[PDB]
């Protein structure tokens, strides 16, 4: 009884693994990046990374490795999913079609077994003889690697050592030999085994157990010719080969522990290391020893290269380039230039890839356009803390507004020879063509000499030979720049009226009724060069010069009124070089030819609002590539505005859009405007690189932003931001933050780097009196005020010592007109486990200064706060308390309600406090105002880890819980039994695959009522640790049933990578119990329906029983689904 | 407050040499399938909440119970003990199944008395309390499952820092500056990925298994000088059950701890109870302090509390104290059936209401805790 619809508004960005190898081809060098469920395949070139393929797998990539067995030309990819769905993939492309085929696949989980504490380890034999997986304690799983093992069957080999830290395969061994470090009561040890496939058991290792450091963490296998393994702890790096042994204690690595590594030389002479706080090291192996051809180590020098982002996965690309794959920061692409050394750093950054995770807090704010929200996150951690502002859509910054009664055409002109800039814009109404002049802020209607006065101009622009043209409804009149005299005027021989006009730099082709005349603009002349007629009236014409030449279009495209067909014909003739019969009924309204990214297209817009993009051949002929995109429900006018050193096409309609090319495909962003009827690029002197947009009410001039669907501005703080709230009246942001300060031997706390708290305009330190070892790191909490326009730190309030600030709310209380920042803290001491004292402090930002209006001292930790109807509701430990803002600016207790749970989460909707804890103990309350106390309505207790919770509506509540799941609970208020009334039934399950930290009501698209509204009700955004912003909406029962049927039918048509069943992937998963998903419709699977081929589209729908408004219409068509699916795509 | 010399050889208390010596023993364990309904016979005349892992002594006299237990030993060996609520007369909805490990039948007194000892194994909730005309009603039993949760960091863990999640063992044992400093780096290194989530590390330490177990061990040693690993299990399930058994709480709190399905919630509840508890006063008076919480030691490996049977079959749970107050004794110190091998129990009563709170266990030898051992029971001891 929930019927909800979940979709991804921004794909995950945090990198949890990256490999290199010859995957796509034996010649190319590929960098494969797994970000979560998405696998990105790049190609390493001199300029950088060139994306090639984007595949999204049905699972979280836990292990991926590239291996090449015998008899293969390029490396294969082995991927293991967190649900233990193993597979082996192979790249296969034929010209334009790219397919990642599944060589093998099979689930490798066990019926019984506790997953290991150190997690999944997946290793592949260097000779590609088997695959070793350590999924479960006390069991080594081995997958034999033979061509006949297409189901990936594996056998378990018993390990007597239950605590295994790191295991890898050794290089240069006749039989597959593993090496690992394990934990014992006597300490940590290194051991090796000789795995035998025939006997299906272990054997005696080449070199026996050796005692290692008490904190030995990783094993790295040195390749031939050195051999053996290198074991890196917190204080030492040791090399083991049996008889040969080395040990070093470099002091440059004692500060932090190494977590990641990657070989940089095929011969393993040098290694690359990274630690927790983000500095690159450089382990070096010296092969100077050579007695009788044998190569042995002699030293283990460690060199510090520099500081990079906090890395999770290092990888060395070709020619001194390192890809630092960060997960709590931003990915980098750095240079290992050993000669630069500007100040003592060996690394310089080249690129920086956006990474929004971890998203700890979000808020939706109408920053620029009223009605359209913007997401301001609290991303990153440690030195990578930053605020991200995500905006959906290209936006136009208005700079002028001249009211006009429905301009029917805007066209720029230059009435100033040798000016190199626009001078005036020639508008054209229904009956007259006014010529407005605009140099600076001028709006004068300065009529040109050669332009007609009372006519609806069809074209007006700068023509060749320093002349201006004006293709009016009467005749094509040519004018002059300097003398401004009518050089020529080609009237219709039969005194007919021109229907459609199209002009180029040197040519002008006009259509009078069903006849087409081609006229060349010779210097001070206009002589017809051709004349022909078509079957029906010309709906539209387009003669745009393609690449090069730019003086004579080889082809001209037209549209037929009574045929609904588009043809391309040679300009100096009438020979139909190609034809097409796209659709029917509604006639074409505009034709345009573009050159997006050196590839030529041909865009035709029908009168119903659908643009049918197609490919065109410049030399001769054309392709078909029929891809109809429904960009609005009004006739579309297509114009080309460069504005980027690129082509770009602005499709004016009820939903204005910019059609650009991202890499080699045409993307379709949407412009944040209500409706633009006509547009024209005005590069006027006073308006640099502006664009005149004419709605049905007025003409506006402004500048477009950057052609990109989602834009993420970054404001680095260099400290971890915890919570964020927005205060409208002050135009400021209230953000909590923490910085790490080391305890020096002077009684103070010195910092580690310049942060946003130590670099504010004005500063403060909390001064309240209501109540170690050299090297210890202590957290210092601040409340920063950040401007919403400049995003500069206006103030930085520092809290007391040992005080942890937990929550934050910006609301006005009681009858007071002032709005405040309410901050709830907790005084935490290392000696004690659970705090005894906290503090509710009310700030007030005015005149650029932060003042503490009021201060309340409570007994506990204030885990959350909400503004329940002019009354702060606080959750002090396990007590939910409601406060009243007195007339003297002092908080007063009104009612208490004691729980047996820690009220970590408080979400209110009217008078219904939703209370939860970290044990998934969702509790529902109601606040009776006539009596003034809280009352418990429902309860749903189930032992499980719950990450967040949100009130979808008065009945359904949504939350995220363990193993990356989602759920919905619903209270049946109509139950006649009290036991069911007091119970919260669970009506939805879903394995999202992501860890949600925050829910927030809002939407990133324009809020239009639309009279008929939309099939989706409500909108809730969530942000995850990996950096994925989703969106969950409700559905009606009929729509839920239709989408469920379509989702079942898509699963038999769409072939996934690895052949993981969608029902299995979305099944609610947990270490103790997994059930199928219910009540959730996957927006990704549904939205993938638009990308399948037409025969597959026909296969998907054959009995859907589409119509619900009377009848069934059992045929159900296939474009009817397109109408439904696009409506769902528009909600995000 | 007798320190140092605690000479008892404190395991004898948990062997019950009073309920007979050469008692026949039973091999090992059994198992009931999770979430299954079972037919488990109910032995009557027992009114006590049997925590799993807790030993339950029993003497059986009436022929119906003797026959039931005989057929029980010859078919399985498990019966049901129901957690009776405040209302008596079969007002129970939860319970635990007892499973036999020692058995002895005596033909003495012209009767077929059967002396038996059992320990709780599983936890269940009764569907319907079917009654049989024989006298031994069989209950409709649903096996309530036991929940174990992974680390709260396992979902939000970073893969890299996972090898750094297998800690070296605790330094030495039970030493200051080896706990307050070890635990700090333990919390800092275990919950380093709490920065990705929205909550600080100490919050995730409040829901930890090992940290809660450490804090509870601290308080229990603060009372009775425990022997580090004096049979305190490493498993949070078993540790929680042991602590719940040994806590000096009333019946409602025991039932509430029995209702809880997860180890972490049980440990948090025990911490709350043991932190908010101070005095133990006489039920029939709710007016007299017959203890405190500091004056409480353990001569049994099972804690300050264990189940013992008087020769009439009634089961008593006794609380061990150094020095009880407001108790008057009657009768010479006698030693016929003492559950503690070497003392001579003297019956104690409230100084006002005169109710059987417990006994004073005076010594016999001289290398003993000299006449300082009050084994107060729970029939009159309301935590106040
Ligand atoms: N149907 C039937 C049927 C058949 C046979 C029955 N037989 C009757 C005769 N019984 C022998 C006998 C009787 C009396 C004693 C004295 O012991 C008593 C008496 C009363 C209360 C308590 C104790 C000991 N005690 C505590 C003190 C603290 C401690 O440490 N341990 C304890 O046990 C008490 O609380 C010893 C042996 C054997 C059984 C029968 F009773 C029913
Ligand atoms: Zn009394």
UniProtKB/Swiss-Prot annotation, chain A:
Phosphorylated by ABL1. It holds the Pfam family CPSF_A. Residues 13-356 are annotated as: WD repeat beta-propeller A. Residues 709-1035 are annotated as: WD repeat beta-propeller C. The keyword Isomerase does not apply. One of its GO terms (cellular component) is nucleoplasm. Pathway: Protein modification; protein ubiquitination. Gene3D superfamilies: 1.10.150.910, YVTN repeat-like/Quinoprotein amine dehydrogenase. One of its GO terms (biological process) is ubiquitin-dependent protein catabolic process. The modification N-acetylserine is found at residue 2. It comes from the Eukaryota. Protein, which is both involved in DNA repair and protein ubiquitination, as part of the UV-DDB complex and DCX (DDB1-CUL4-X-box) complexes, respectively. Core component of the UV-DDB complex (UV-damaged DNA-binding protein complex), a complex that recognizes UV-induced DNA damage and recruit proteins of the nucleotide excision repair pathway (the NER pathway) to initiate DNA repair. The UV-DDB complex preferentially binds to cyclobutane pyrimidine dimers (CPD), 6-4 photoproducts (6-4 PP), apurinic sites and short mismatches. Belongs to the DDB1 family. Component of the UV-DDB complex which includes DDB1 and DDB2; the heterodimer dimerizes to give rise to a heterotetramer when bound to damaged DNA. The UV-DDB complex interacts with monoubiquitinated histone H2A and binds to XPC via the DDB2 subunit. Component of numerous DCX (DDB1-CUL4-X-box) E3 ubiquitin-protein ligase complexes which consist of a core of DDB1, CUL4A or CUL4B and RBX1. DDB1 may recruit specific substrate targeting subunits to the DCX complex. It is linked to White-Kernohan syndrome: An autosomal dominant disorder characterized by global developmental delay, variably impaired intellectual development, hypotonia, and characteristic facial features. Some patients may have genitourinary and skeletal abnormalities. This is DNA damage-binding protein 1. The gene is DDB1.
Curated annotation (Swiss-Prot), chain B:
GO terms for molecular function: metal ion binding; transmembrane transporter binding. Keywords: Cytoplasm, Disease variant, Intellectual disability, Membrane, Metal-binding, Nucleus, Phosphoprotein, Ubl conjugation, Ubl conjugation pathway, Zinc. The keyword Phosphoprotein applies. Residues 277-384 form the CULT domain. Ubiquitinated, ubiquitination is mediated by its own DCX protein ligase complex. It is found in: Cytoplasm; Nucleus; Membrane. It is a peripheral membrane protein. Pfam families: LON_substr_bdg, Yippee-Mis18. Its main location: cytoplasm. GO terms for cellular component: Cul4A-RING E3 ubiquitin ligase complex; cytoplasm; cytosol; membrane; nucleus; perinuclear region of cytoplasm. Widely expressed. Highly expressed in brain. Changing residue 345 to A: Abolishes thalidomide-binding without affecting DCX protein ligase complex activity. Residues 40-278 form the Lon N-terminal domain. Pathway: Protein modification; protein ubiquitination. Substrate recognition component of a DCX (DDB1-CUL4-X-box) E3 protein ligase complex that mediates the ubiquitination and subsequent proteasomal degradation of target proteins, such as MEIS2, ILF2 or GLUL. Normal degradation of key regulatory proteins is required for normal limb outgrowth and expression of the fibroblast growth factor FGF8. Maintains presynaptic glutamate release and consequently cognitive functions, such as memory and learning, by negatively regulating large-conductance calcium-activated potassium (BK) channels in excitatory neurons. It is linked to Intellectual developmental disorder, autosomal recessive 2: A disorder characterized by significantly below average general intellectual functioning associated with impairments in adaptive behavior and manifested during the developmental period. MRT2 patients display mild intellectual disability with a standard IQ ranged from 50 to 70. IQ scores are lower in males than females. Developmental milestones are mildly delayed. There are no dysmorphic or autistic features. Thalidomide was widely prescribed to pregnant women in the late 1950s as a sedative and as treatment against morning sickness. Thalidomide was found to be teratogenic, causing multiple birth defects. More recently, thalidomide use has increased for the treatment of multiple myeloma and erythema nodosum leprosum, a painful complication of leprosy. The CULT domain binds thalidomide and related drugs, such as pomalidomide and lenalidomide. Drug binding leads to a change in substrate specificity of the human DCX (DDB1-CUL4-X-box) E3 protein ligase complex, while no such change is observed in rodents. Belongs to the CRBN family. This is Protein cereblon. The gene is CRBN.
């Amino acid at each position: 009884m929930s019927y909800n619809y979940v979709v991804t508004a921004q794909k995950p960005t945090a990198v949890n693994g990256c490999v290199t190898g010859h995957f796509t081809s034996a010649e190319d060098l590929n960098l494969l990046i797994a970000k979560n469920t998405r696998l990105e395949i790049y190609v390493v070139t001199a300029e950088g990374l060139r994306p090639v393929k984007e595949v999204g797998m049905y699972g979280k990539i836990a292990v991926m490795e590239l291996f090449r067995p015998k008899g293969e030309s390029k490396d294969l990819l082995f991927i293991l999913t967190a649900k233990y769905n193993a597979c082996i993939l192979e790249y296969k492309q034929s010209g334009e079609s790219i397919d990642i085929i599944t060589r093998a696949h099979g689930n490798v989980q066990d019926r019984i077994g506790r997953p290991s504490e150190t997690g999944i380890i997946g290793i592949i034999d260097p000779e590609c003889r088997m695959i070793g997986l350590r999924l479960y304690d006390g069991l080594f799983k081995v997958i034999p690697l033979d061509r006949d093992n297409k189901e990936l069957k594996a056998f378990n080999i018993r390990l007597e050592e239950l605590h295994v830290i790191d295991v890898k395969f050794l290089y240069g061994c006749q039989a597959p030999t593993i090496c690992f470090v394990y934990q014992d009561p006597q300490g940590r040890h290194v051991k090796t085994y000789e795995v035998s496939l025939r006997e299906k058991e272990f054997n005696k290792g080449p070199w026996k157990q050796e005692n290692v450091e008490a904190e030995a963490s990783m094993v790295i296998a040195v390749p031939e010719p050195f051999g053996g393994a290198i074991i890196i702890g917190q204080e030492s790096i040791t090399y083991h080969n049996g008889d040969k042994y080395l040990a070093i204690a470099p002091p440059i690595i004692k500060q932090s522990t190494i977590v990641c590594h990657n070989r940089v030389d095929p011969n393993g002479s040098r290694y690359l290391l990274g630690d927790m706080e983000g500095r690159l090291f450089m382990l070096l192996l010296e092969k100077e020893e050579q007695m009788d051809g044998t190569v042995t180590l002699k030293d283990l020098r460690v060199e510090l290269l520099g500081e990079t982002s906090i890395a999770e996965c290092l990888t060395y690309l070709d020619n001194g380039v390192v890809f630092v794959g960060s997960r709590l920061g931003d990915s980098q692409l750095v240079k290992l230039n050993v000669d630069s050394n500007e100040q003592g750093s060996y690394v310089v950054a080249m690129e920086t890839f956006t990474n929004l995770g971890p998203i700890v807090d979000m808020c939706v704010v109408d920053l620029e356009r009223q009605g359209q929200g913007q997401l301001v996150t609290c991303s990153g951690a440690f030195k990578e803390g930053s605020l991200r502002i995500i905006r959906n859509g290209i936006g136009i910054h208005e700079h002028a507004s001249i009211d006009l009664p429905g301009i029917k055409g805007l066209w720029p002109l230059r009435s100033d020879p040798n000016r190199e800039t626009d001078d005036t814009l020639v508008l054209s109404f229904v009956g007259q063509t006014r010529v407005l002049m605009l140099n600076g802020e001028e709006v004068e209607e300065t009529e040109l000499m050669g332009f007609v006065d009372d006519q609806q101009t069809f074209f007006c622009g700068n023509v060749a030979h320093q002349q201006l043209i004006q293709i009016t409804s009467a005749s094509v009149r040519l004018v002059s720049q300097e003398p401004k005299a009518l050089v020529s005027e080609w009237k219709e021989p039969q005194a007919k009226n021109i229907s459609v006009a199209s002009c180029n730099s040197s040519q002008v082709v006009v259509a009078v009724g069903r006849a087409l005349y081609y006229l060349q603009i010779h210097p001070q002349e206009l002589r017809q060069i051709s004349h022909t007629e078509m079957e029906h009236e010309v709906a539209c014409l387009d003669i745009t010069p393609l690449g090069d030449s730019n003086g004579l279009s080889p082809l001209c495209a037209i549209g037929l009124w009574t045929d609904i067909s588009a043809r391309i014909l040679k300009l100096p003739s009438f020979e139909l070089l190609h034809k097409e019969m796209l659709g029917g009924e509604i006639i074409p309204r505009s034709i345009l030819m573009t050159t997006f990214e050196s590839s030529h297209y041909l865009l035709c817009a029908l009168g119903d609002g659908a643009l049918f993009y197609f490919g065109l051949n410049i030399e001769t002929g054309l392709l078909s590539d029929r891809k109809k995109v429904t960009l609005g429900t009004q006739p579309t006018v297509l114009r080309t505005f460069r504005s980027l050193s690129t082509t770009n096409v602005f499709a004016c309609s009820d939903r204005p859009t910019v059609i650009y090319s991202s890499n080699h495909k045409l993307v379709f962003s949407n412009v944040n405007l209500k409706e633009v009827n006509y547009m024209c690029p005005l590069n006027s002197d006073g308006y640099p690189d502006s664009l005149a947009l004419a709605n049905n009410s007025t003409l506006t001039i402004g500048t477009i932003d950057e052609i990109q669907k989602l834009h993420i501005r970054t404001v680095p703080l260099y400290e971890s931001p915890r919570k964020i709230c927005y205060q409208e009246v002050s135009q400021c942001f209230g953000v909590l933050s923490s910085r790490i300060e080391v305890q020096d031997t002077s009684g103070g706390t010195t910092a580690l780097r310049p942060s946003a708290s130590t670099q504010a305009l004005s500063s403060s330190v909390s001064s309240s009196k209501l109540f170690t070892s050299f090297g210890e790191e202590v957290e210092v909490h601040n409340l920063l005020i950040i401007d919403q326009h400049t995003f500069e730190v206006l103030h930085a309030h520092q809290f007391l010592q040992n005080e942890y600030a937990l929550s934050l709310v910006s609301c006005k209380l009681g009858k007071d007109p002032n709005t405040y920042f309410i901050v709830g803290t907790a005084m935490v001491y290392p000696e004690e486990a659970e705090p005894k004292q906290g503090r509710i402090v009310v700030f007030q930002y005015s005149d650029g200064k932060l003042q503490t209006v009021a201060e309340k001292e409570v007994k506990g930790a204030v885990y959350s706060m909400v503004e329940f109807n002019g009354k702060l509701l606080a959750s002090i430990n396990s007590t939910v308390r409601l406060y009243e803002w007195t007339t003297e600016k002092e908080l007063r207790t009104e009612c208490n309600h004691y729980n047996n749970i820690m009220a970590l989460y408080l979400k209110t909707k009217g008078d219904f406090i939703l209370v939860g804890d970290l044990m998934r103990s969702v509790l529902l309350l109601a606040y009776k105002p006539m009596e003034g106390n809280f009352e418990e309505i429902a309860r749903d207790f189930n032992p499980n880890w719950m990450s967040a919770v949100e009130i979808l509506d008065d009945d359904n509540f949504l939350g995220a819980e363990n193993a990356f799941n989602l759920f919905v609970c619903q209270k049946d208020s109509a139950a006649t039994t009290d036991e069911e009334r007091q119970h919260l039934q669970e009506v939805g399950l879903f394995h999202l695959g992501e860890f949600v930290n925050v829910f927030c009501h809002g939407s990133l698209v324009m809020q239009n009522l639309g009279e008929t509204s939309t099939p989706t009700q409500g909108s809730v955004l969530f942000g995850t640790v990996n950096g994925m912003i989703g969106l969950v909406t409700s559905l009606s029962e009929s729509w839920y049933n239709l989408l469920l049927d379509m989702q079942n039918r898509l699963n038999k048509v769409i072939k996934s990578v690895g052949k993981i069943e969608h029902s299995f992937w979305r099944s609610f998963h947990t270490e103790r119990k997994t059930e199928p998903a219910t009540g959730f419709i996957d927006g990704d699977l549904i939205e993938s329906f638009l990308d399948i081929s037409r025969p597959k589209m026909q296969e998907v729908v054959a009995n859907l029983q589409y119509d619900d408004g009377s009848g069934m219409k059992r045929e159900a068509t296939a474009d009817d689904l397109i109408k439904v699916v696009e409506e769902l795509t528009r909600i995000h | 407050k007798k320190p140092n010399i605690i000479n008892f050889d404190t395991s004898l208390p948990t062997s019950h040499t009073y309920l007979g010596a050469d008692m026949e023993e039973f091999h090992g364990r059994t198992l009931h399938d999770d979430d299954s309904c079972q037919v488990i016979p109910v032995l009557p005349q027992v009114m006590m909440i049997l925590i799993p892992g807790q030993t339950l002594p029993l003497q059986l006299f009436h022929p119906q119970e003797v026959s039931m237990v005989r057929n029980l030993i010859q078919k399985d060996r498990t019966f049901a003990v129901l957690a009776y609520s405040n209302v008596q007369e079969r007002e129970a909805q939860f319970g635990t199944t007892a499973e036999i490990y020692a058995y002895r039948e005596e033909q003495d007194f012209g009767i077929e008395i059967v002396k038996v000892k059992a320990i709780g194994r599983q936890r269940f909730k009764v569907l319907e309390l079917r009654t049989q005309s024989d006298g031994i009603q069989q209950a409709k039993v649903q096996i309530l499952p036991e929940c174990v949760l992974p680390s709260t960091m396992s979902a939000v863990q970073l893969e890299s820092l996972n090898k750094c999640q297998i800690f070296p063992s605790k330094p030495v044992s039970r030493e200051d500056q080896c706990s307050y400093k070890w635990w700090q780096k333990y919390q800092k290194r275990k919950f380093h990925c709490a920065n990705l989530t929205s909550w600080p590390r100490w919050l995730y330490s409040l829901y930890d298994a090992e940290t809660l177990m450490d804090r509870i061990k601290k308080q229990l040693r603060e009372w009775d000088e425990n022997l580090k690993d004096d049979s305190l299990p490493s498993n949070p399930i078993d540790f929680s059950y042991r602590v719940a058994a040994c806590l000096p709480i009333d019946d409602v709190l025991r039932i509430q701890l029995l209702k809880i399905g997860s180890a972490i919630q049980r440990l948090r509840c025990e911490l709350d109870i043991m932190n908010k508890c101070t005095s133990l006063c006489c039920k029939q008076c709710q007016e007299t302090e017959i203890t405190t919480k500091n004056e409480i030691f353990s001569l049994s490996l099972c804690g300050p509390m264990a189940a013992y049977v008087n020769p009439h079959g009634y089961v008593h749970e006794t609380l061990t104290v150094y020095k009880a107050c407001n108790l008057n004794l009657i009768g010479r110190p006698s030693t016929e059936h003492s559950w503690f091998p070497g003392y001579a129990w003297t019956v104690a009563q409230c100084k006002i209401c005169a109710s059987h709170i417990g006994w004073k266990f005076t010594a016999t030898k001289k290398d003993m805790s000299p006449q300082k051992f009050w084994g107060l029971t729970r029939s009159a001891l309301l935590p106040t």
